[PDB]
């Protein structure tokens, strides 16, 4: 009841509420994949969301744009390559790094994450199960995250493009990330080696798009042998800012946040200045929709199996899924990532030979400005000189000096595949990427001081002399401070545009953790911590850029701890610094054209 379209219907409304909006196909579960097309259906959960909040890909599907000829790598916990709704799309070259074989299928029943990821991207278009976002894309799986994987550098390289088997993928799906309580540098040998690989693979003629989950730490993370979350008084700032995983600021990664079926940020989604776009991840599939996708086959394996019940109605279900080959509980930025990988494969199938940067440009300029009125999250405190200040800790939607709308929650906005394809038709390639040399400032004197609940930020500046249009900016920062989450770290462009690189009250509570279990503190502060902002996309680079750091808190905070080994619950107390912090150095790298 949804016919094929040609290229060439005049008067075609490609939008989210068009009368032409429908998905072709005979996949029995596709009408409960709200992420393909959101009609307010419940995804087998207790209730539906709001119609239109989806990837707006229906016109791609109707015109036969389906991911044909695009190779997607799923680097994850496994991939059941024989799955009845995946096998047709599996091409040769998967590697099981636990067994040595070509078959990354898991043998552990809980290891269903990568198979669920794969279905969102490329479940086969046929008369069973679901329909993938890009149902003619071809998959490989590399099970780097199986419980018994050693997660060896050699295998990460193999899976992310540095072997014969994987080099000719044009999309790398990384539904994974790191949570931390102490800051990390991005300069380790292993990290820089992967960054060199991602640079090579992105910028070459057959260029590959790396896609990366922002994290699911808005409220809780697991790190250091614990599950941690804040409790008590406090602003609604993410516990995990998306700039914390050092990998998320490497530029080559397109980092995505998760959106739910109501058209707002998924409760758990990490956010920050480095989010490029928002894509569909849902909630939990219990009370509200999550991602209907391919499960490990059988009722003894996967997220849909007898031993791991769910209130999602697809799971118990002899009528709709008698061999428990599908599930309704897949979620997370882990799901926003394949939603993005799928969108990217659709674009690449229509316009092969546009660069990754051009595809980013199209995705950014075509994104939907969802949740347009969400407010900034403010931090109020009495400053050191007696004045109450109320400053942004996280922005809402803001328009930069070049006219581009951006938010740390949604990036440039929710993916709109149909509109990206409309823009692509007459898109002129961007000029080649220019990566300006790093500019490092070594800060000295009384300008280094960061006062407790400062009345003004501590500022340090550097002038970019080169005319350039900005795409992204990277910063590295070094400072001393005895209670890191008190710090708000911002970057200001020559136009006066601001971007919060690190929101305060994040998960960097490890100094307090160390005091409690060791009796001393290992972390003095940030050391070459990398952050990235997309806020400045389109702006002129020439002029003075300003790093501004403020300590915005002198009150005590409590953090709840759950010991992962011993389910014992304890309480961590962050006590105020009581010696002023110190900026040591920072570096700026402008990436543009
Ligand atoms: Ca199917
Ligand atoms: Ca199953
Ligand atoms: Ca403080």
Curated annotation (Swiss-Prot):
GO BP term, pick one: protein processing
Swiss-Prot/TrEMBL catalytic activity: Cleavage of -Lys-Lys-|-Xaa and -Lys-Arg-|-Xaa bonds
GO cellular component, as recorded: cytoplasm; endomembrane system; extracellular region; intracellular membrane-bounded organelle; membrane; periplasmic space
Assigned EC number: 3.4.21.121
Null allele phenotype: Disruption mutant releases negligible serine protease activity and does not affect plasma clotting.
Ranges for domain P/Homo B: 430-593
EC class name: hydrolase
pH-dependent activity: Optimum pH is 7.5.
Residue numbers binding Ca(2+) 2: 295-296, 298, 301, 304, 324
Residues passing through the membrane, by range: none
GO molecular function: metal ion binding; serine-type endopeptidase activity
Note on how the cofactor is bound: Binds 3 calcium ions per subunit.
Principal subcellular localisation of the protein: periplasm
Requisite cofactors: Ca(2+)
Keywords linked to the UniProt accession: Calcium, Disulfide bond, Hydrolase, Metal-binding, Periplasm, Protease, Secreted, Serine protease, Signal, Virulence
Disulfide bond entries: 2-22, 299-324
Activity regulation remarks: Folding, maturation and production of the active form of the protease by the cell requires a protein (ORF2), encoded just downstream of asp, which acts as a chaperone. Formation of a complex with ORF2 in the periplasm also inactivates the protease activity and likely protects ASP from intrinsic proteases. In vitro, protease activity is inhibited by human alpha-2-macroglobulin, suggesting that this inhibitor can impede ASP virulence activities in A.sobria infection sites. However, slow ASP inhibition by alpha-2-macroglobulin in plasma may indicate insufficient ASP control in vivo.
Database matches in PANTHER family: NEUROENDOCRINE CONVERTASE 1 (PTHR42884:SF14), PROPROTEIN CONVERTASE SUBTILISIN/KEXIN-RELATED (PTHR42884)
Family the entry assigns: Belongs to the peptidase S8 family. Furin subfamily.
Subunit description: Forms a complex with the chaperone ORF2 in the periplasm. After translocation of the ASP-ORF2 complex from the periplasm to the extracellular space, the complex is dissociated in a pH-dependent manner.
Protein name: Aeromonas extracellular serine protease
Native source species: Aeromonas sobria
